[PDB]
Write a protein that binds this DNA or RNA. Structure first.
Ligand SMILES: [Ca+2]
Ligand SMILES: [Ca+2]
Length: 757
DNA sequence: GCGGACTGCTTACCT
DNA sequence: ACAGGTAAGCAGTCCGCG
């Protein structure tokens, strides 16, 4: 099982290190043979010996092309002749590349910004996390003495928790008598002790929650102040911070630093992303939070260190338990994309697709398009037409069937062979022409992406067949992750086509997919209404809600499956319409906003205030109960009484503050905001007090009794006190509870004023 | 000028 | 930022009024 790669420099020459785990043992293979390179397209070969003479200085050393061999490749299908320029050191590439491009003979240069370690993985055809090799993991968390407006790392670490499958222990430097605590000399000894625990346990995976930003960064400042060599590396190195866009990443060589935060953020949609919130989402059990003021008060006083120690233990235990839950699916993602778990666990869906394509491009001798520069990125600023959203038939309706296409965008990309290499090819025989947009895609030969997408669809069939004929419950879960992850990768290619930073960006490809999508959903609706007896209530993009008005359940279901038997043969290649489900009643509010109740009585909610985090629990909960009254039961009168029960309780100040918290995200640097609002105003105040506000930070706030701009009386839910502060009953009634219900109860004929206490 | 209509910024959903 | 389509809060600005 390959874990990761990197390189070290020995006497000016690059040396690859492959971090393997084979036969229950960690190993480092060294490769001194592999050479860095990029490609150059020349106007004429006669110029090669002039471009070989081209030189550059890199930090006191003349960088020169080691050699050049001419190679034949494909660029977007068409064969191309380019010169593969080799260099002695991978760092030679950044120094030389700009000059070799500037040279008058050189039309362009290609594949010049591929990190050496990853160039090796691809070129050698190596896939990390292969085999059935069991890895040992250690989770760890830290507790600190934080004070308001304090610099980072000024406060000493109070406790270092760690947890695995066998134990969960705290390490601190105060006298705490509980079984799992370890009292040491000082802070210095506590840190040196943890290093010895890691050395002794030699774990293959370190697990943190947001360690990339807080935990590891904190320990490096502490170590430097204490003059400690922080040696977790199996090679004996210190953990290295690697910038990752607007955030950092900590790498520990020989081990896998598995930070759950980026994983949880990409996989689960929650109001907040606290350990306590995530643990409750994933496992269902609760976990209480200890606060910084309580922590410092418990240390300075020495009164209640035992509760602060339990929190530190439950942190590490929970982090390990989440570690074990998420690591397996992420290790499959690593195999599929063919990059380290570390890289893939922190990577956006753009980079995952791009890494996959780079690997497959190499296998198929396809030269990779360059990432766009400032002025080319500028040209891709334009948008394009998306999905077709039908204006819904508002109100309550009976006997509703949901029909939708299966993988419509992948179906279209494959069926119509949508790829940049097949776009407007000079002299084909057969063509598919996109409706409205009018781009022509060659049908003579398979396109790069279409072909890869065919491979994935069939690869997925094999896995689902292999899944049926296998008992081992663990092997079944690991193949279930592979097949689910293939599905996601496949559904990412359309979006990737329209992603301006993408190497294989193709607006024409993206446009044509959406256009065909609109043709098929609109054709299905037209057929369903004009020829069959259906009224289409709502249709978004690739799916529709239909009924036959003067008919019953049995009839609507039977006629729907009959329409599938009719239409699917008339639909080309992959394109196939499917019966998702029947619903006894359905309530369509607006575009993107509806609710349905099935045979069992389960209400499915889409788009309504119930699902959004930027609405208070009191409004979401109240709406949930108004909706249930009108779907589940037939009681429009019950719905009105619950509106009264909510509003009256709010004006008496009875509804508890937990149900008043509104969650909005900070999505840019606080200075980039052009318009202020409750969450931004709250976040700017926290910033002035020296609280860390990075993009992704969720602001949780409560509105206090007052008038005028909401932001002026918006404070963190943390700092809410019934002692001094008083919550705005009027606001939560007229701005939250009433708007949420009016949407549901507007249809029957109630105005806001008629639902208030 | 008042006060409601309107609209840009912004978020978070849907597919 | 993997895409565009969409509704709606907030806080400014707009604009109709007798
Ligand atoms: Ca549905
Ligand atoms: Ca078909």
């Amino acid at each position: 099982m390959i874990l990761d790669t990197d390189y070290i420099t020995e006497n000016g020459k690059p040396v690859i290190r492959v971090f393997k785990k084979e036969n229950g043992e960690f190993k480092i293979e060294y490769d001194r043979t592999f050479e860095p390179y990029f490609y150059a397209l020349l106007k004429d070969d006669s110029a090669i010996e002039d471009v070989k003479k081209v030189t550059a200085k890199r930090h006191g050393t003349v960088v020169k092309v080691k050699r050049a061999e001419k190679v034949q490749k494909k660029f977007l299908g068409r064969p191309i002749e380019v010169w593969k320029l080799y260099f002695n050191h991978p760092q030679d590439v950044p120094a030389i590349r700009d000059r070799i491009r500037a040279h008058p003979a050189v039309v362009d240069i290609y594949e010049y910004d591929i990190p050496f370690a990853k160039r090796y993985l691809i070129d050698k055809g190596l896939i990390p996390m292969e085999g059935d090799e069991e890895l040992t993991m250690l989770a760890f968390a830290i507790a600190t003495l934080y004070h308001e407006g304090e610099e980072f790392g000024t406060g000493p670490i109070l406790m270092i928790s760690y947890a695995d499958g066998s134990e969960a222990r705290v390490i601190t430097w105060k006298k705490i008598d509980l079984p799992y605590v370890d009292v040491v000399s000082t802070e210095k000894e506590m840190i040196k002790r943890f290093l010895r625990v890691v050395r002794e346990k030699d774990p293959d995976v370190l697990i943190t929650y947001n360690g990339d930003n807080f935990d590891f960064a904190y320990l490096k400042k502490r170590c430097e102040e204490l003059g400690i060599k922080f040696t977790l590396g199996r090679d004996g190195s210190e953990p290295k911070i690697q910038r990752m866009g607007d955030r950092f990443a900590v790498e520990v060589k020989g081990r896998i630093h598995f930070d759950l935060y980026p994983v949880i953020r990409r996989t689960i949609n929650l109001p907040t992303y606290t350990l306590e919130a995530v643990y409750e989402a994933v496992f269902g059990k609760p976990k209480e939070k200890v606060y910084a003021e309580e922590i410092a008060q418990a240390w300075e006083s020495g009164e209640g260190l035992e509760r602060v120690a339990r929190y530190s233990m439950e942190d590490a235990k929970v982090t390990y338990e989440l570690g074990r839950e998420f690591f397996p699916m992420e290790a499959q993602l690593s195999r599929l994309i063919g990059q380290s778990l570390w890289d893939v666990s922190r990577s956006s869906t753009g980079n995952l697709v791009e890494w996959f394509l780079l690997r497959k491009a190499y296998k198929r001798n396809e030269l990779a398009p360059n990432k766009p520069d400032e002025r080319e990125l500028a040209r891709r600023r334009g948008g394009y037409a998306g999905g077709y959203v039908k204006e819904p038939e508002r109100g309550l309706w009976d006997n509703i069937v949901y029909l939708d296409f299966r993988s419509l965008y992948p179906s279209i990309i494959i069926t119509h062979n949508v790829s940049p290499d097949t776009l407007n090819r000079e002299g084909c025989k057969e063509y598919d022409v996109a409706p409205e947009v009018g781009h022509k895609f060659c049908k003579d030969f398979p396109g790069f992406i279409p072909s890869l997408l065919g491979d994935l669809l069939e690869e997925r069939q094999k896995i689902k067949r292999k899944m049926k004929a296998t008992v081992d419950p663990l092997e079944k879960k690991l193949l279930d992750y592979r097949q689910r992850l293939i599905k996601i990768l496949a559904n990412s290619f359309y979006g990737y086509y329209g992603y301006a930073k993408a190497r294989w960006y193709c607006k024409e490809c993206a446009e044509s997919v959406t256009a065909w999508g609109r043709e098929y959903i609109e054709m299905v609706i037209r057929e369903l209404e004009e020829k069959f007896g259906f009224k289409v209530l709502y249709a978004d993009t690739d799916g529709l809600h239909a009924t036959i008005p003067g008919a019953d359940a049995e009839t609507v279901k039977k006629k729907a499956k009959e329409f599938l038997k009719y239409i699917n043969p008339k639909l080309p290649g992959l394109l196939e319409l499917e019966y998702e489900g029947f619903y006894v009643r359905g309530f369509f509010v607006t575009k993107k906003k509806y609710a349905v109740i099935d045979e069992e009585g389960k209400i499915t909610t889409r788009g309504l205030e119930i699902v959004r985090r930027d609405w208070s629990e009191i409004a979401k909960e109240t709406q949930a109960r108004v909706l249930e009254a009108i779907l589940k039961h037939g009681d429009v009168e019950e719905a009105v009484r619950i509106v009264k029960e909510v509003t009256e309780k709010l004006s008496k100040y009875e509804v508890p503050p937990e149900k008043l918290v509104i969650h909005e995200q900070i999505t840019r640097d606080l200075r980039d905001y052009k318009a202020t609002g409750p969450h931004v105003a709250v976040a700017k105040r926290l910033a002035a007090r020296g609280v860390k506000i990075r993009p992704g930070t969720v602001i949780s706030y409560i509105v206090l009794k007052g008038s005028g701009r909401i932001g002026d009386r918006a404070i963190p839910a943390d700092e809410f006190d019934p002692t001094k502060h008083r919550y705005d009953a009027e606001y939560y009634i007229e701005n939250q509870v009433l708007p949420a219900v009016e949407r549901i109860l507007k249809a029957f004929g109630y105005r806001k004023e008629d639902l208030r206490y």
